[PDB]
């Protein structure tokens, strides 16, 4: 049974990830998101779509990744039931409405994203589409959640030569050579994300900007934060920081707790 377990509400959005509806689990009124993905658009499979494999690998009590509650196969599609925080806003819309974020808030958000991406990598999962559009803010708890694992892959140490994430977050070695390694490409996208948070939009729109190696700051940003961004956006992948080096960076120290973040910046 699928139409009897959940009450379907309005469409929340559609795109490369499929179509996602608001829903409620009938048994206990739990808020959920109901995500439909057409089979003809699923490139990678595992043992079910790769998206389901990856979501199951990262599922746990840890709150930094979206929780897959259940899934169903239909003749032409798969349906994924995801936890739904309420109230919620994705980080793209949040930055559009707020503009450039205060660095204390960017620090808290960026820290939580780093913890979530570390969790993915610990679980053998490479997300490959880290961006503000794919991060949800649980506004009451001040907790961020990664969503949209449909571009992801099993984490490996050899080279990737396929990519279907977001090009303006993709690294210059992908643009130039169609070759990247998982961790250093993730760090590049985290540099784009951090710039996005503290400047109000991403730094690069065009391939020539991505490979050019120049970061111009369009908002007042602290020297420490600029340093961390430029390090994550190093042109040479081996010149980028590890996740440990990012979290030990001086700009990242004294992070707010999630509930402190909600009370100061979200309530």
């Amino acid at each position: 049974p699928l139409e009897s377990q959940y009450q379907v509400g309005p469409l929340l959005g559609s795109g490369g990830f499929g179509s996602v509806y608001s829903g409620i689990r009938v048994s206990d009124n739990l808020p959920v998101a109901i995500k439909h993905v057409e089979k003809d658009r699923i490139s990678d499979w595992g043992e079910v779509p790769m998206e389901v494999v990856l979501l199951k690998k990262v599922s746990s009590g840890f709150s930094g990744v979206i929780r897959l509650l259940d899934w169903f196969e239909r003749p032409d599609s798969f349906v994924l039931i995801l936890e739904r925080p309420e109230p919620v806003q994705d980080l793209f819309d949040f930055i559009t409405e707020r503009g450039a974020l205060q660095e204390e808030l960017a620090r808290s958000f960026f820290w939580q994203v780093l913890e979530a991406v570390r969790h993915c990598h610990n679980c053998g999962v490479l997300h490959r589409d880290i961006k503000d559009e794919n991060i949800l803010i649980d506004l009451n708890r001040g907790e961020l959640k990664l969503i949209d694992f449909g571009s992801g892959a099993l984490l490996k140490d050899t080279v990737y030569t396929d990519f279907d994430g977001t090009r303006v977050y993709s690294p210059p070695e992908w643009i130039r050579y169609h070759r990247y390694h998982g961790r250093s490409a993730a760090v590049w996208s985290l540099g784009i994300l951090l710039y996005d948070m503290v400047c109000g939009d991403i730094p690069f729109e065009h391939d020539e900007e991505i490979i050019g190696g120049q970061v111009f700051f369009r908002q007042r940003v602290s020297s420490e934060c600029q340093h961390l961004i430029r390090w994550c956006l190093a042109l040479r992948p081996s010149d980028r920081p590890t996740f440990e080096e990012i979290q030990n960076h001086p700009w990242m120290q004294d992070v707010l707790l999630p509930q402190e973040t909600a009370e100061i910046h979200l309530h």
């Binding site: 490369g16 990830f17 449909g150 571009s151 977001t166 939009d201």
Partner: peptide, 9 residues
């Protein structure tokens, strides 16, 4: 300056 979403997938 225009801010926009970007497709993936």
């Amino acid at each position: 300056r225009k801010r926009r979403r970007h497709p993936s997938g």
